[PDB]
Amino acid sequence: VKKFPEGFLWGVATASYQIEGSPLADGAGMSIWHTFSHTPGNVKNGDTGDVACDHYNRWKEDIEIIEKLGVKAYRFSISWPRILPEGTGRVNQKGLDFYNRIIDTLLEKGITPFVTIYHWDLPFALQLKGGWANREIADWFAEYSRVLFENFGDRVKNWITLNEPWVVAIVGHLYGVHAPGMRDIYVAFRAVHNLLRAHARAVKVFRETVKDGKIGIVFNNGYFEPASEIRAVRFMHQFNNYPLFLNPIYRGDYPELVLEFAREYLPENYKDDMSEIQEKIDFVGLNYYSGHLVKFDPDAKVSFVERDLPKTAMGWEIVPEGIYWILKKVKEEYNPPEVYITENGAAFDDVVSEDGRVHDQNRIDYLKAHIGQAWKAIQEGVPLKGYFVWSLLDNFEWAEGYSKRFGIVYVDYSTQKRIVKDSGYWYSNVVKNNGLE
Ligand SMILES: OC[C@@H]1[C@@H](O)[C@H](O)[C@@H](O)c2nnnn21
Incomplete structure (x- = not known):
């Protein structure tokens, strides 16, 4: 048998644009994923998040499934433009209400919420102002995070600033495969840097507003192996994996091989921001x-x-x-x-x-x-x-x-x-047993 530690948190995860549908319901502003998917050619089969899993309406049933499976934690994200339809300024109470019901329901049922503040659905209004390319996003993101903390931090005690900032920057602004669908390497590395600055300002606000919770950040990672007898692997790890962001957070600079490839694309005085980036997570x-x-x-x-x-x-x-x-x-x-x-x-x-x-x-x-x-x-x-x-x-x-x-x-x-798959049944047993057998 393989038993996990006592109190180990077994969870399932989703993201707002992927499951909710109803992107423009109840006063929500458009996101960049709304406008990107509504642009012909960007998404397979012309699919969009207009309906998705209809979680915007079916949220209670879905949480009841989590409960029935005995799953202990639910990681979900909040749609920024549901909360601040223009990205900054006006707060939409109906958007807050949607997540308030989810949070309260989870708590009543003994499921721990893990909230992802940003899982890629940037307000369209902020994209018009350059989105992640604009240094001012550190301020916009800090203001958004503060609203969430003020409204939910009494109940939600586990927070994630960003989902996969590498993807947001590179896939969204270099490869152009994700929203906002750009192909500019200088913009992409500015987005990297501003993602770190925004993450750090949000952690700073967190310490001032939710003195009793915990906050972190999420990275994509792959396992890169060399095709023989090695540095290309060192580069992929440093660039595509957690070091691109954790080297700044823990050590105050980008990883060595990232700087080799990309120095010319970063802001000239990017080091000026590194002391603030080291905000403790x-x-x-x-x-x-x-x-x-x-x-x-x-x-x-x-x-x-x-x-x-x-x-x-x-x-x-x-x-x-x-x-x-x-x-x-x-x-x-x-x-x-x-x-x-x-x-x-x-x-x-x-x-x-x-x-x-x-x-x-x-x-x-x-x-x-x-x-x-x-x-x-x-x-x-x-x-x-x-x-x-x-x-x-x-x-x-x-x-x-x-x-x-x-x-x-x-x-x-x-x-x-919804039909629970054999894998869902299997996982529920893993959770109940606190491990494998
Ligand atoms: O591609 C499958 C899933 C996406 O659905 C998630 O939104 C994203 O966080 C992710 N990162 N790596 N794999 N994923």
């Missing part, structure tokens, strides 16, 4: 899904090498040992006081069998192998306090639309019916 959240084989390639000087390994429906190679590696590595590099795995999961081509069930043994195998590796890191002294499955529900998978199903609960979009 309470925990680090690591997301982890996939591994990659990496070679130097003269034509970021880096390319991936395809491996004959099992893959998910995303085409992502399944490499469970990567979750152990990333957990050991974060301890070794920055020794954060607490770590959470804030996302782990997989997309597979789920179908409802004639028996009414969704037999996703593939997802069970995936989760089991990763949970086992996380257990290993704990035995070796990593202060892992919780693990969150992405996702509770099949949902809007960004530029892939509804074509990729990550839920432990199946959503039939024609009816909005």
Whole structure:
């Protein structure tokens, strides 16, 4: 058997734009994901978050599912433009009311809320003012965070400033694959820097407003292996993984190989901001899904090498040992006081069998192998306090639309019916047992 520590927090995770629908209901302003997905060509099949899982209406049923599964924590995000429709200034009470009901319901049911302040649905109004490219976003984000803290901090005691700032910056502003859909490397590195500044101002406000809670930040991470006999791997870790942000937070500068590649793209006097960026955080959240084989390639000087390994429906190679590696590595590099795995999961081509069930043994195998590796890191002294499955529900998978199903609960979009998958049942047992067997 593999038993986890007493009080270990087993959770599931979602994000507002991916599940809620009703993006313009009750006075909400448009987000950049609304306008991006409504632009032809940006999302597969022309899919948008207009309806999604209809969680905006079905939230109580969904939380009742979390409760019934015995899951102990729910990580969800708040839509900024539901709360401040123009990004700054006016606060929308109906937007606050929506999350107030979710929070109170979770608490009544003994489920711990983990709130992600920003999971990519920037107010459109702020994008018109340059969004993450504008230094003033540190102020806008601080003001938004303060509203959340003032309204919810009496009840929510666990906060995440940003989901995956690497993705927000690079995928949104260099690759142009995510909102706001830009391709400018100078803008992308300014977004990196402002994401750190905004995160730090929000932590600063947190210390002044919620003297009894904890706050951290969440990073995407992959397990990069060299295609042979190495520095391309060092570069990928430093750039794509937690070091891009934790080196500033803990050490007051970007990682060495990031500075090699990208110095010319950062603001000239970026070091001036580093003392403020070191604002103390309470925990680090690591997301982890996939591994990659990496070679130097003269034509970021880096390319991936395809491996004959099992893959998910995303085409992502399944490499469970990567979750152990990333957990050991974060301890070794920055020794954060607490770590959470804030996302782990997989997309597979789920179908409802004639028996009414969704037999996703593939997802069970995936989760089991990763949970086992996380257990290993704990035995070796990593202060892992919780693990969150992405996702509770099949949902809007960004530029892939509804074509990729990550839920432990199946959503039939024609009816909005939820069907707990075999993986959901399996996970509920893991949680009940506080581990594997
Ligand atoms: O792509 C699947 C999921 C997304 O749905 C989440 O929104 C995002 O936080 C993430 N990071 N890595 N994998 N994911």
